[PDB]
Structure formats: structure tokens, C-alpha cells
Design a protein around this ligand. Structure first.
Ligand SMILES: Cc1cccc2sc3[nH+]ncn3c12
Length: 112
């Protein structure tokens, strides 16, 4: 498998996932200045900007590398926020809509 087409695919996939986050609540790191207790609960923060930096640093060399960090975005948000919040429901919606994006993108990776 060639590296360049794979990273092109991950870039497109990351763009499609970001499009599902219409409120852009996962676009940048959770601002630790506004939620000082966040690192009490969350062992590894994640967000789409960090994912883009990891992608371009060649830290994602298989689809699981990539999907694990996406899953962290979702799971961290479900963990930190109460069920009756916009943030929690946004993570549920992203899990649902993003899972479909990822399934198709992984099938294309497997054609490489
Ligand atoms: C995005 C965001 C901003 C401020 C506070 C919080 S608390 C949380 N959980 N997921 C995202 N966020 C935020």
C-alpha cells in the first residue's frame, strides 16, 4: 500500500467528519481555561484540529489509528457532559453520522 493515496483518503474523511460537527464543538481542543476540571475525568483530550496535525505528522498509518482518535472525540464528550446537554447529544449525533462516513472510508482504504 502506498502512503500518499492513503493520506489523501484520510484528509477527505476528516473533512467529511468535520462537516457533521455543524456546531464546530469538536473543531479545537476543549478550552481547559473554561473547564478547569476537565482533565480530572478525561485522560486524553482530542479534537479535529489535533487530528489534522497528527495526520500531517504521519502519525496515522492505518485506519484504526485514525478511527481511535475520532472515537476519543466522541467518548470524551459523552464522559464529561451530562446526558441532558447539547454537548452530549452532539457527540451521540457525531457517533451516528460519523460512523457512516468511516465505514465507507475504511472500505476505500481496503481497496488499496
Ligand atoms: C467545546 C467546549 C467549549 C467549552 C466547554 C466545553 S465542555 C465540552 N465537552 N465537549 C466539548 N466541550 C466544550
Amino acid at each position: 500500500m502506498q502512503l500518499t493515496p492513503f493520506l489523501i483518503l484520510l484528509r477527505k474523511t476528516l473533512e467529511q467528519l468535520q462537516e457533521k460537527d455543524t456546531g464546530n464543538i469538536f473543531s479545537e481542543p476543549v478550552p481547559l481555561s473554561e473547564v478547569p476540571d476537565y482533565l480530572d475525568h478525561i485522560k486524553k483530550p482530542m479534537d479535529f484540529f489535533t487530528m489534522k496535525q497528527n495526520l500531517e505528522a504521519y502519525r496515522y498509518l492505518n485506519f484504526d489509528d485514525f478511527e481511535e482518535d475520532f472515537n476519543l472525540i466522541v467518548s470524551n464528550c459523552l464522559k464529561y457532559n451530562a446526558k441532558d446537554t447539547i454537548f452530549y447529544r452532539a457527540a451521540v449525533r457525531l457517533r451516528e453520522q460519523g460512523g457512516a462516513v468511516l465505514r465507507q472510508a475504511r472500505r476505500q482504504a481496503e481497496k488499496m
